[PDB]
Each structure stands twice: as structure tokens, then as C-alpha cells.
């Protein structure tokens, strides 16, 4: 099971995340699992629920071992309660291996499972520092590297309208041009540093620590580009100014309401490009990733609205720092090089573009009067 067989192993409908097929237990029970770089638990629905098509049945697995420890994970609004154990885990369209890993068997949940997402669990790919109940609960990826010869690296190619998760290597057929690396600041979330933000090449002209208040992360489990209050307001002001030929409700800018245009007439040209400059591997060198409106204006698939093309503004205000979500990752080949504590970005085969503009990864960029951009 090489990278060739790993290509196109991801699915997922707009705004509901990307999932990979996995097996838990012996005989293997097949489930769809959300690929999440923003969390560190492997947590699977293990009891019936209105939104679950299937769930993990521990009584049917002869390899299951109960850890006699509970886990309670509350979020902003949603939450899940579970029971810890271990069992045999495999990724049928990933590395040709089966490992023993920690599993949080979800017995109760509230606003966690999404109606029609098609996933029954979450694969948290981030570090042990943020694992629940504590850092002593070894994440799946750490177990995989420990128990197999798989190199300490994975890559994500998320595509808009599926994609690929490549474990253990870089698949050179999934990207064009250069791979540019940003250092992983701290191993907890995939924490990175944004050194500059431009909107249609116009610098937001803020102290770069503002872009990373209190952290900046690469999160496949978050849909939007989430921005700290001060940065979000200036980005919205710039986007509204550039798109002034059309006026949208306040609701649109709050990411709550749809903006629709008759099929094939979306005025892409009126919306600006967002450039996120990421800290390079060498002092005061950086590179940028360019985000087109085809990424930040997320299409909302609905048969009832299908005579038009409708979208949600996929940029939102955050109080927990910058979040480079799925809309940001889409179109790029993102390398999570845990072995070298770095994240690589390159233009992917499924990048967004039109006749005038294209998603890009460019560098190097030099700054001479640069402070440290982190908090
Ligand atoms: C656990 C979950 C999560 C749990 C359940 C569903 C999702 C989800 C929802 C919509 C699309 N994709 C994934 C995410 N995964 C991630 N990354 C977050 C998170 C959100 C904001 C900041 C930091 C972390 N929440």
C-alpha cells in the first residue's frame, strides 16, 4: 500500500470536513473518520445516535481492551463523553499496516455529529499536549510511527468541487512548483507564524504579533479562515471596499447568510485575493500562499437553491487566534513534516484558478526591520 494507492482516499461534502475510511477492532469494523489536524484524540461514535449510520461495537471486537478511564470533551457549544480503551486500527487506503491505538468510545454527545456529514469519528492528528484527558494519552499518529517503520510525516491534499491523505511521504504528483516550509513553532496544535497579510497586494500594516494573537494554527477540522478580532475587521473592511460595486447584507459578512448569483455568473473579479505570508526556515525570510475568492466564498450545495450558485463568506472572527482552515488548505499540497518540525505548502493538482488569477505559493520575501511575530 504505497502513495499510488493512497491518492483519492478522502471524501467530504463542503463545510462538513474531509474523512478517511478506517477499521477498528477484530474482525475489522469499517468507519468514516474526519481527518483533523486541530485535535489529538482518536474518538469514534460507539453508541446509536440519530445522525450515525453506524458505530463502533466493542462487544463484537475480540481485540478490544477497556482502559477503565472516562473522557469528557466539551467545545464552545458541542460536547462528547466517552470511555477509553485500545484496539486494532488500520487505514485500508493508507499505509499497509495495522496498529494498536487509543480509542475514545463516544457513548454520549451533544451537537457533535452532523446530519449527513457521513463520518462517525475523528482522527486527531495534532500533538499529545492537547490530547484529552491529558498528554499521557498517546495520539494515533505517535502509535503508528512507534509500532511501524512509517516515516514521521503526513501530507494533505484537500480538494473542492475529495482529496488525498498520504502517510509517510511526499507524493510529487500531487503538486507543482516549489514546496515552501514554515516552522512548527510549538508541538501542540500545528502552530505556525504569519508575518504579513495583504489584500489585493495592499499590506494590512499591523504589528505582525496581531496576526498570531494568541496563536496561529493549520486546522483541517475547521472550515473557515478564522482571524483575531482586529485582523478580521481590517480584512472585512478591505474586502468590502474592493467589492463595493455590490452591496451585501451585514449577515453575509457575519458568515451566517447566503449570497446567490444565477448559475455561472459569480463576479469573482470584484473580490480580492488574500496573501498570507508565513515565516520561512531562515531569519526574516518568508513565503506567501494566495487565497482566491473561489476559496473564501464557500459554495453551499442545496438542491432547492440549485438554479443559482450560492455561497457563505468563509472568513470569521476568532477569539482563540488565527485558524487556517479547510478553505485555506484547499488547492494546496500541505506537508505536515513532524520529523523536521515544519509545514510545507505547494500548489496542488486541484488548486483554484480562473482565466485571470490562480492560487499560488511564492517566495522568498525579505524583511529587514522584523521583530519576532509570535506571542
Ligand atoms: C474537534 C473539532 C471538531 C469537532 C466536530 C466537528 C468538527 C467539524 C465541523 C465542521 C467541519 N469540519 C469539522 C470539528 N475539530 C477541530 N479542529 C475543532 C476546532 C475548532 C476550532 C478551533 C480549534 C479546534 N473542533
DSSP string covering 238-254: HHHHHTTTS---HHHHT
Q: Which residue's CA is the nearest one to ligand 1's atom 25?
A: 221
Among the candidates 150, 180, 215, a domain finishes at 150
Please give the grid coordinates belonging to residue 216. 496561529
Q: What share of the chain is helix, strand, coil (3-state, %, to 5)?
A: 15, 40, 45
Which residue in this structure is represented by grid cell 455529529?
A: 113
CA separation for the pair 338, 345 (Å, rounded): 14
Residues 189 and 205 sit within 8 Å (Cβ to Cβ): no
**Residue 3 covered by a domain:** no
Among the candidates 112, 135, 150, a domain finishes at 150
Residues 102 and 86 sit within 8 Å (Cβ to Cβ): yes
97 and 166 fall within a common domain: no
Q: Is the CB of 36 under 6 A from ligand 1?
A: yes
**Residue 210 covered by a domain:** yes
Question: Alpha carbon 318 to chain centroid distance?
Answer: 16
**Residue 53 covered by a domain:** yes
Residues 55 and 67 sit within 8 Å (Cβ to Cβ): no
Pocket test for ligand 1, best of 13, 124, 221, 329 (most atoms within 8 A of CB): 221
CA separation for the pair 104, 96 (Å, rounded): 23
**Residue 12 covered by a domain:** no
Q: Is the CB of 113 under 6 A from ligand 1?
A: no
Nearest to 286 by CA among 216, 195, 168, 218: 195
Please give the grid coordinates belonging to residue 127. 500533538
Nearest to 189 by CA among 12, 40, 47, 56: 40
**Residue 10 covered by a domain:** no
CA separation for the pair 265, 262 (Å, rounded): 6
190 and 231 fall within a common domain: yes
Q: Is the CB of 17 under 6 A from ligand 1?
A: yes
Element (H, E) at 301: none
120 and 157 fall within a common domain: no
Resolution in A: 2.0
Residue 74, domain extent: 18-150
221 and 124 fall within a common domain: no
194 and 339 fall within a common domain: yes
133: CB partners within 8 A, 6+ apart: 69, 71, 72
CA separation for the pair 42, 142 (Å, rounded): 12
CA separation for the pair 9, 20 (Å, rounded): 6
CA separation for the pair 227, 82 (Å, rounded): 31
Pocket test for ligand 1, best of 222, 224, 225, 322 (most atoms within 8 A of CB): 222
Q: Is the CB of 239 under 6 A from ligand 1?
A: no
CA separation for the pair 322, 317 (Å, rounded): 9
Among the candidates 103, 118, 150, a domain finishes at 150
103 and 167 fall within a common domain: no
Element (H, E) at 237: helix 229-242
96 and 54 fall within a common domain: yes
**Residue 129 covered by a domain:** yes
CA separation for the pair 93, 19 (Å, rounded): 12
Q: Is 270 helix (H, G, I), strand (E, B) or coil?
A: helix
Q: Which residue's CA is the nearest one to ligand 1's atom 24?
A: 38
Active-site residue list: 36, 219
Element (H, E) at 358: none
Pocket test for ligand 1, best of 14, 15, 36, 44 (most atoms within 8 A of CB): 36
| Residue 94 Cα to ligand 1 middle (Å) | 23
Element (H, E) at 69: strand 65-74
Q: What is the CATH number of the domain that holds 240?
A: 2.40.70.10
136 and 176 fall within a common domain: no
168 and 116 fall within a common domain: no
Give the method of determination. Answer: X-ray
- First-residue to last-residue Cα distance in the chain: 42
| Residue 64 Cα to ligand 1 middle (Å) | 27
232 and 354 fall within a common domain: yes
CA separation for the pair 74, 85 (Å, rounded): 20
**Residue 226 covered by a domain:** yes
Q: Return the CA Rg of the chain.
A: 21
Neighbours of 284 (CB within 10 A): 14
Strand order in the sheet with 225-228: 191-192, 216-218, 322-324, 225-228, 315-318
DSSP 8-state secondary structure symbol assigned to residue 273: P
Q: Which residues share a beta bridge with 227?
A: 317
Q: How many CA atoms lie within 13 A of 157 on its CB side?
A: 25
CA separation for the pair 326, 337 (Å, rounded): 18
Strand order in the sheet with 297-299: 259-262, 308-313, 297-299
Q: Tell me: cis bond preceding 364? Omega within 30 of 0 counts.
A: yes
Nearest to 56 by CA among 127, 122, 130: 122
Number of compact structural domains in the chain = 2
**Residue 307 covered by a domain:** yes
Q: Which residue's CA is the nearest one to ligand 1's atom 14?
A: 221
Q: How many CA atoms lie within 13 A of 305 on its CB side?
A: 11
Please give the grid coordinates belonging to residue 361. 505559493
122 and 162 fall within a common domain: no
DSSP 8-state secondary structure symbol assigned to residue 320: S
Residues 336 and 252 sit within 8 Å (Cβ to Cβ): no
66 and 192 fall within a common domain: no
Cα diameter, the chain: 64
Atom of ligand 1 nearest to the CA of 37: 17
Which residue in this structure is represented by grid cell 495583504?
A: 198
Cα 112 to Cα 52, 75, 97: the distances in Å are 11, 9, 29
- The torsion angles phi and psi of 8, rounded to 5 degrees, stand at 65, 30
Amino acid at each position: 500500500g504505497s502513495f499510488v494507492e493512497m491518492v483519492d482516499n478522502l471524501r467530504g461534502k463542503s463545510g462538513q470536513g474531509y474523512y478517511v475510511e478506517m477499521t477498528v477492532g477484530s474482525p475489522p469494523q469499517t468507519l468514516n473518520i474526519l481527518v483533523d489536524t486541530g485535535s489529538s484524540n482518536f474518538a469514534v461514535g460507539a453508541a446509536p445516535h440519530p445522525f450515525l449510520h453506524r458505530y463502533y461495537q466493542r462487544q463484537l471486537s475480540s481485540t478490544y481492551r477497556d482502559l477503565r478511564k472516562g473522557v469528557y470533551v466539551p467545545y464552545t457549544q458541542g460536547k462528547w463523553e466517552g470511555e477509553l480503551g485500545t484496539d486494532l486500527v488500520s487505514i485500508p487506503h493508507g499505509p499497509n499496516v495495522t496498529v494498536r491505538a487509543n480509542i475514545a468510545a463516544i457513548t454520549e454527545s451533544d451537537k457533535f455529529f452532523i446530519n449527513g456529514s457521513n463520518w462517525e469519528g475523528i482522527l486527531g492528528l495534532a500533538y499529545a499536549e492537547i490530547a484529552r484527558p491529558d498528554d499521557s494519552l498517546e495520539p494515533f499518529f505517535d502509535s503508528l510511527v512507534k509500532q511501524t517503520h512509517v516515516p514521521n510525516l503526513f501530507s494533505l491534499q484537500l480538494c473542492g468541487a475529495g482529496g488525498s491523505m498520504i502517510i509517510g511521504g511526499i507524493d510529487h504528483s500531487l503538486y507543482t512548483g516549489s514546496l515552501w516550509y514554515t516552522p512548527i513553532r510549538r508541538e501542540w496544535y500545528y502552530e505556525v507564524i504569519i508575518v504579513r497579510v495583504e489584500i489585493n497586494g495592499q499590506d494590512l500594516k499591523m504589528d505582525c504579533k496581531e496576526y498570531n494573537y494568541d496563536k496561529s494554527i493549520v486546522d483541517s477540522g475547521t472550515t473557515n479562515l478564522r482571524l483575531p478580532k482586529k485582523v478580521f475587521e481590517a480584512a472585512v473592511k478591505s474586502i468590502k471596499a474592493a467589492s463595493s460595486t455590490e452591496k451585501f447584507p451585514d449577515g453575509f459578512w457575519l458568515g451566517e447568510q447566503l449570497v446567490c448569483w444565477q448559475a455561472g455568473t459569480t463576479p469573482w473579479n470584484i473580490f480580492p485575493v488574500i496573501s498570507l505570508y508565513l515565516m520561512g526556515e531562515v531569519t526574516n525570510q518568508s513565503f506567501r500562499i494566495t487565497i482566491l475568492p473561489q476559496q473564501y466564498l464557500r459554495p453551499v450545495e442545496d438542491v432547492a437553491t440549485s438554479q443559482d450558485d450560492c455561497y457563505k463568506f468563509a472568513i470569521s472572527q476568532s477569539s482563540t487566534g488565527t485558524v487556517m482552515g479547510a478553505v485555506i488548505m484547499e488547492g494546496f499540497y500541505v506537508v505536515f513534516d513532524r520529523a523536521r518540525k515544519r509545514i510545507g505548502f505547494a500548489v496542488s493538482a486541484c488548486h483554484v484558478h480562473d482565466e485571470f488569477r490562480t492560487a499560488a505559493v511564492e517566495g522568498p520575501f525579505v524583511t529587514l526591520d522584523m521583530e519576532d511575530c509570535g506571542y
